[PDB]
Design a binder for these strands. Structure first.
Ligand SMILES: C[C@H]1COc2c(N3CCN(C)CC3)c(F)cc3c(=O)c(C(=O)O)cn1c23
Ligand SMILES: C[C@H]1COc2c(N3CCN(C)CC3)c(F)cc3c(=O)c(C(=O)O)cn1c23
Ligand SMILES: [Mg+2]
Ligand SMILES: [Mg+2]
Ligand SMILES: [Mg+2]
Ligand SMILES: [Mg+2]
Lengths: 671, 702
DNA sequence: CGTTGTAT
DNA sequence: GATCATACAACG
DNA sequence: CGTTGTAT
DNA sequence: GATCATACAACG
């Protein structure tokens, strides 16, 4: 179908390239030899055909096209109808590229063992840098010129293609190693595996390739950092918005601009997934504390408008992550192009990891953190600072539990919640809020991530199957005033609507379960499941560090300014002689230093003084500023040397921030 | 199908909204009443069912879904199965929105006349501006209405917020509800076709939506150059289609004679200039520049924008591209995504972007009003003839072939030297169109002369082939010829037994030789010339090209112009822009000289100056009085640094003063002489011709 | 019908 | 990320 | 089986 | 500009 076949059938000379990107496929087809080189693009990530039947594999259109292209059936085929001498897999140097490579290797090993054993499976190794090396630095196959692609991966005289082989006595390890990687079950074995950690062995390639993707997804994709509770994509988005000046007080700008900036500066991925994550951050029903200010259609409790239409802006809450940024609080690593710099963390003032929470899926592990109440978590942190010996139960007496932005009751025993937080893993269930008035049941609040229309459809279908003769009629009185209003009117006032309600809790989606897995990337740099006490403590460490760094930065600034000011006052005290030196001495810079006992910095400061600064008001301003800066310097130096004053400062900032960004408990606890 | 129906069947109360955007449809569905309001989105421009059969209309999925939604067949139906009391068309305030409106009006008028006559067709008028000062909030569909609102708000506590809606997708659901949905606050007009007006309605709508005619639309556009509860459909349709027509003509399809660019292209190259993506700069991701174009200047889609950009980057599409990309930008077709490709302006683009910040072009504010945008670009060479353009508007179109830079430059210089130069004399310089595809342009020089004399015509190209040895080898194809399509054509022609003379067809097109098509004959006695003529007549080895020199002149109105008119008018543009540059630089030099004189005066009496500074409260007016010095010079003295009190600084200032005096003399001299001005223009033209010069790619033959 | 190029 | 139907002029 | 959220 | 199949962990 989408194949671009060659003008030859002679094996041991013909080559079939499987390209990752359709665009990359176009570039490859533009540079092939055509006399023996055919190019077939595989649109997107293929299926995991390691636990699929030999007949079920033909169902997937990608694997189907691959099968038809190779001219072999997923069973013993043994050449014969092999249309190409060599089948080479060509994907870019991404971790995702190695993932696709490992997938194709799984498909080939499991369903075409004869082909791999005969030595027809090849891996194309593209260069990572060009000055070629396996400086320009190619981000992908789509980004590199056709001729470059030809020289790098196509032309045999200049190519670097390795042959993947599964020799005897290594075939046992191959089938064994590849199993734990691509098996839908196991999973824990993959956790432990990640924990412990011209021709090439297929088992060696698969093990090293899958490690790259696993580590990349775990560290730089699915799992959030304990500091600001953000994933790389989200951090890049909010920072690129900060750079775009899109503050909460600023005017709205088109989403396409900020997205294009995120891609063009920091995020080397697609615009679709980026704008998707952004839209997710902008939704009040998706995010407890969004960041998170949009104009236009940003969805509803679903799908939204295009980025070419919507306009965006950071929330006032986002300040908690973006204030104190340019004050030497976070470290900076350079971006993919090396043209700009990017913050590794954000100077969070409140533990966003607990506030907003996160849900993600990596390789071998996942993360599921529920949102919480800002005031409660803040109070818990402050309590943790005041009394460091505070146990988990006392913290639980402050933080009731998860706080979802969907109202409704969280029906879960306080002991069960206590266990969930003490062990870091568990499940929390929510139930819709309903009231009888009058005699009829009206739902006024739905659980988190409940469609509402789907619930109505569920009850309606259940009625249609004659399973609910107790209910006379179902009406949706959900208007602008009342967002969620689902009325259920029963036939006769003798029917137990409570029993029907419990039945709806058991059958419909009025009651929902939520996975809880407090897994995150700690300050150590490695992912780990942590309990509430550990999270609050470690975050307290992070905050303490960042605050300390801010204080030191400000201290240095103040000191330098004080030095320059002292120099300036010295200048003013003897301005006539200074100006005289300027207009009578050859190179007055070192002359000023000698005559007044002044540093080169202070000398340059004097030299940079303006004539309008010779007025008296300027000397007054400078002296006053000197006094103020002296007091501030004393304060900063004082707080820096006392652990008590430092902790007190942290407490002050926590309480102050808790008041400004505070919110009442939305989802109450019940049973 | 995509309908979000309401929970009622009671007519004279139920309303059906036809939304332009699926996203806007989402916003509308999110804000409807559901008790009587149903929402159906129409994704994209509908079909023009004004010359289509009553059955052919049902073939188009959009019109089909609309028909099923209304519960009426495109023939006489007469209510009965009418599912909704009112059918309202909802589109954003674009000219494109009014186009969609006119299209839906065509569909309803021709195929559902009974429905429109009964009064069920409604047009929803959305607000263009939103003004809010405090708890007060106002909406306005007219700019005059907006300025009216602002005048009233001038009595209240200041600082009002104007929003300006670019479309329905960008406005919040509740705003859409209050503005166009909620009956108590909406502004929906009823479209009616009363008796004796139905004849005029059918007449006016015909010339607008008829595939033929066209010239009538030209003449109509030529001659053509508050609200109530109900409006005449013919009055609405004629004015709506006028808006779209004028918008497409002026701000879409037709290029401006100055820089030879369309609004999209101009916005792209300017946004690249602002992004600092110069020819000497490093490549940046295309998504960045596209996102900038959309986020700053262009209020349209990213796809079509990146499409135009990619088209500008192609060496085979653009004679002089601008136009520097890395990655897959297509081949002689389609390309890679913007998330992968990297971009940068060409060295040629300098000709449009140099002299930008020198007061050469006018500036209009952007859609948000936050930034400014150039109306034109200070072109140094007539890009309108160099690159050429192809576009389709309403009533008219434009087809301009590319030309050779050296030839056109030489023609311009010749036009400056001898202003009485005729068209033939210019034609002796400019041979004709110059395509970036090699190959011969087999067209009589007289025919070309006529084509250029009338501004309209057609130029034909033919592939370049040679016999070696005994076999025919094609080495160059005409512009926009696929080659693979040519191969497929000849091969199919062979398969149909139409070519028994030809033994074999081979594609020896490699990296070294881009186009190499070998045709081997059976036996050496067959006349391959006859076969070649047959392939020229049948296959795509010979291609015709439309020529329609229509463009927007300096007058501001589109018109077909001949080569002499184009070159002359462009010479006017260039002369004017150069004059503006010279004047700008002159003003700068003069001001700097003034400031320098002030500074020297200050240096001459520095002690007294410092005295005034340290003895007079606010010395600015004191310095002015004591030395006879302007406020600007006073501020200049006040901003002097102590390190500038040295002698070397005064020396530098004096030397710069001398230089600036000489430069001022030169600038003022060139400004007052027509001969010196013309000499400057000639010098710059010749200089540009050398640096950006190109050899003739497509030779002329017969 | 089949193109061409900015638009939805 | 590639693809699908549409408007509009006007020639082969 | 069907979700959830960054990825091809 | 909306849509379609995929990986990955893991619960109901
Ligand atoms: C604005 C959207 C509107 O919808 C579109 C299409 N439709 C889908 C099938 N429908 C039956 C008819 C409408 C379409 F076929 C192509 C495009 C398209 O190429 C495009 C672009 O920006 O390049 C943008 N759009 C398109
Ligand atoms: C990798 C690209 C190309 O393939 C994609 C899809 N396929 C099309 C149908 N095929 C049968 C299977 C693959 C797809 F259904 C969705 C997406 C998608 O949502 C997306 C994104 O960036 O958000 C990007 N891609 C997608
Ligand atoms: Mg990639
Ligand atoms: Mg997607
Ligand atoms: Mg619009
Ligand atoms: Mg398109």
């Amino acid at each position: 179908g989408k194949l671009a076949d060659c003008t030859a059938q002679d094996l041991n000379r013909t080559e079939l390239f499987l390209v990752e990107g359709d665009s990359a496929g176009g570039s490859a087809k533009q540079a092939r030899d055509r006399e023996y080189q055919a190019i077939m693009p595989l649109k997107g990530k293929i299926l995991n055909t390691w636990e699929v039947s030999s007949d079920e594999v033909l169902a997937s259109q990608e694997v189907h096209d691959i099968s038809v292209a190779i001219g072999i059936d997923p069973d013993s085929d043994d050449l014969s109808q092999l249309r190409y001498g060599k089948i080479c897999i060509l994907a870019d140097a991404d971790s995702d590229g190695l993932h696709i490579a490992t997938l194709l290797c799984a498909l080939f090993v499991r369903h075409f063992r004869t082909l791999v054993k005969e030595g027809h499976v090849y891996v194309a190794l593209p260069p990572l840098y060009r000055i070629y090396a396996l400086v320009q630095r190619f981000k992908g196959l789509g980004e590199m010129n056709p001729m470059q692609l030809r020289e790098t991966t196509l032309d045999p005289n200049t190519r670097r293609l390795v042959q993947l082989v599964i020799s005897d006595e290594d075939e046992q390890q191959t089938t064994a190693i590849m199993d734990m990687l691509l098996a839908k079950k196991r999973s824990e074995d993959r956790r432990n595996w990640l924990q412990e950690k011209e021709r090439l062995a297929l088992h060696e390639f698969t093990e090293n390739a899958y490690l790259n993707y696993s580590m990349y997804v775990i560290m730089d994709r699915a799992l959030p950092f304990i500091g600001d509770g953000l994933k790389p994509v989200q951090r890049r988005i909010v920072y690129a918005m900060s750079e775009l000046g899109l503050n909460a007080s600023a005017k709205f700008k088109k989403s396409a601009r900020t997205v294009g900036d995120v891609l063009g500066k920091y995020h080397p991925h697609g615009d679709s997934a980026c704008y998707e994550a952004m839209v997710l951050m902008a939704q009040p029903f998706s995010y407890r504390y969004p960041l998170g200010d949009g104009q236009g259609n940003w969805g509803a409790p679903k799908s939204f408008a295009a980025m070419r239409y919507t306009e965006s802006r950071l929330s006032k809450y986002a300040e908690l992550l973006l204030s104190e940024l340019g004050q030497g609080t976070v470290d900076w690593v350079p971006n993919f192009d090396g043209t700009l710099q990017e913050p590794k963390m954000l100077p969070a003032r409140l533990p966003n990891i607990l506030l907003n929470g996160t849900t993600g899926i990596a390789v071998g592990m996942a993360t599921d953190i529920p949102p919480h109440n800002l005031r409660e978590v803040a109070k818990a942190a402050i309590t943790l600072i005041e009394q460091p010996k505070t146990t988990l139960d006392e913290l639980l007496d402050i933080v009731q539990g998860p706080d979802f932005p969907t109202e409704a009751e969280i029906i879960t025993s306080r002991a069960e919640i206590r266990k969930i937080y003490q062990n870091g893993r568990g499940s929390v269930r929510m139930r819709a809020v309903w009231s009888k008035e009058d005699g009829a049941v009206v739902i006024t609040a739905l659980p988190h991530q409940v469609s509402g229309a789907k619930v109505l459809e569920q009850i309606a279908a259940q009625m249609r199957n004659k399973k609910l003769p107790m209910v006379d009629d179902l009406r949706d009185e959900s208007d602008h005033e009342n967002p969620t209003r689902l009325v259920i009117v029963p036939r006769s006032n003798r029917v137990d609507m409570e029993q029907v309600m419990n039945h709806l809790f058991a059958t419909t989606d009025l009651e929902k379960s939520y996975r809880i897995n407090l897994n995150m990337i700690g300050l150590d740099g490695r992912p780990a499941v942590k309990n509430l006490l550990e999270i609050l403590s470690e975050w307290l460490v992070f905050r303490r560090d960042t605050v300390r760094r801010r204080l030191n930065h400000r201290l240095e600034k103040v000191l330098k300014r004080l030095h320059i000011l002292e120099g300036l006052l010295v200048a003013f005290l003897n301005i006539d002689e200074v100006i005289e030196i300027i207009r009578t001495e050859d190179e007055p810079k070192p002359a000023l230093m000698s005559r007044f006992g002044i540093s080169e910095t202070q000398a340059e400061a004097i030299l940079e003084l303006k004539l309008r600064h010779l007025a008296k008001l300027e000397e007054m301003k400078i002296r006053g500023e000197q006094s103020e800066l002296e007091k501030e310097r004393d304060q900063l130096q004082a707080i820096l040397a006392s652990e008590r004053k430092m902790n007190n400062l942290l407490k002050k900032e926590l309480q102050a921030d808790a008041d400004a960004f505070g919110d009442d408990r939305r989802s109450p606890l019940h049973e």
